[PDB]
Design a protein around this ligand. Structure first.
Ligand SMILES: *[C@@H]1O[C@H](CO)[C@@H](O[C@@H]2O[C@H](CO)[C@@H](O[C@H]3O[C@H](CO)[C@@H](O)[C@H](O)[C@@H]3O)[C@H](O)[C@H]2NC(C)=O)[C@H](O)[C@H]1NC(C)=O
Ligand SMILES: *[C@@H]1O[C@H](CO)[C@@H](O)[C@H](O)[C@H]1NC(C)=O
Ligand SMILES: *[C@@H]1O[C@H](CO)[C@@H](O)[C@H](O)[C@H]1NC(C)=O
Length: 280
């Protein structure tokens, strides 16, 4: 059966980028409710949001108007400038001796384990880190190839919320190493923000957007169903159709991996056992 692991990373800093840390915190809450263990969830977030001077609700982060506090109970493995290419790629590879700073948590995975990666915070051929240097497609894909060569996982799902997201994988990500990638946008498109000041029932004294369109769409989907009854492929189709007006949700890698239920990666919340997913 193996263990479920996750790496959650917001690649930005600054209060204006509230939404990236909010999205990642939200994802944490999904995993926790699903039975995924903290020792197997590696979290990269700058940690300048919850107690920011501009934060009208100190100690709270929401990913939705009227939402719960997604910040409570979120482990922090790498914060501040310990979020960088070196530590991110070392964490994925599971190379503890290459980590500088932070907790030292890495993907020490076994052949039957499942890996879920979620990145939020892009341009053609690169995604952001809090500070330069940024993460280039080739560098990311090479780490993913090395990890595959180690054979230390069964399959991996990688979700990317970024501008031109598909550019990180397009024509690079191998299709037979059990890695499936879903991107908020194609290699030529920007991705949309949502939950901005002005929207109805928006909490007062917020001047920042709470989430990213593709992110909150998938994340709210994960909160809504028994995840044994919904596959990665069904979420792809659901979310792609739902936000087609905004950007083209794109997929890469080993497409058959997406035939697994979401629960294989995320578990399921027992409270949603009777909420069977409808459609495909
Ligand atoms: C709350 O959010 C604030 C805005 O995002 C954030 O302020 C920013 O603070 C950082 C770090 O203190 C500043 O960065 C500095 O460091 C580099 C060198 O590495 C300098 O070259 C920079 O010019 C600067 O001195 C940002 O300048 C600053 N940004 C703004 C717009 O003020 C606060 O730090 C956050 N507060 C908490 C509690 O996290
Ligand atoms: C892990 O990191 C160390 C320190 O930089 C390096 O010497 C070692 O070869 C790395 N392991 C692999 C196999 O990438
Ligand atoms: C974006 O995705 C579509 C769907 O297959 C594809 O035709 C296109 O080549 C990709 N990007 C563009 C507009 O070049």
């Amino acid at each position: 059966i193996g263990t479920r692991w996750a790496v959650l990373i917001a690649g930005s800093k600054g209060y204006h980028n509230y939404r990236h840390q909010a999205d990642v915190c939200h994802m944490y809450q999904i995993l926790r409710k699903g039975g995924v263990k903290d020792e197997n969830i590696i979290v990269f977030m700058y940690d300048d949001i919850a107690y920011n001077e501009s934060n009208p609700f100190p100690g709270i982060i929401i990913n939705k108007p009227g939402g719960e506090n997604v910040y409570k109970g979120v482990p922090k493995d790498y914060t501040g400038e310990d979020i960088n290419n070196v530590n991110f790629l070392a964490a994925i590879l599971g190379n503890k001796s290459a980590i500088i700073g932070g907790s030292g948590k890495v993907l020490d995975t076994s052949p039957n384990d499942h890996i879920f990666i979620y990145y939020a915070x892009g341009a053609p051929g690169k995604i952001g880190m809090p500070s330069k240097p940024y993460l280039y497609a080739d560098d990311l894909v090479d780490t993913l190839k090395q990890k595959a060569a180690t054979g230390t996982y069964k399959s991996m799902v990688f979700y990317v919320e970024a501008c031109n997201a598909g550019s990180m994988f397009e024509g690079l990500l191998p299709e037979g190493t059990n890695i499936y990638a879903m991107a908020a946008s194609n290699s030529t498109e920007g991705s949309w923000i949502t939950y901005c000041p002005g929207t109805p029932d928006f909490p007062p004294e917020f001047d920042v957007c709470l989430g990213d369109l593709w992110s909150i769409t998938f994340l709210e989907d994960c909160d809504a169903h028994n995840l044994r009854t919904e596959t990665v492929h069904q979420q792809f189709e659901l979310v792609k159709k739902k936000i087609a007006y905004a950007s083209t949700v794109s997929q890469y890698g080993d497409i058959p991996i997406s035939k697994d239920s979401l629960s294989v990666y995320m578990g399921t919340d027992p409270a949603n056992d009777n909420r069977t997913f409808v459609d495909e």
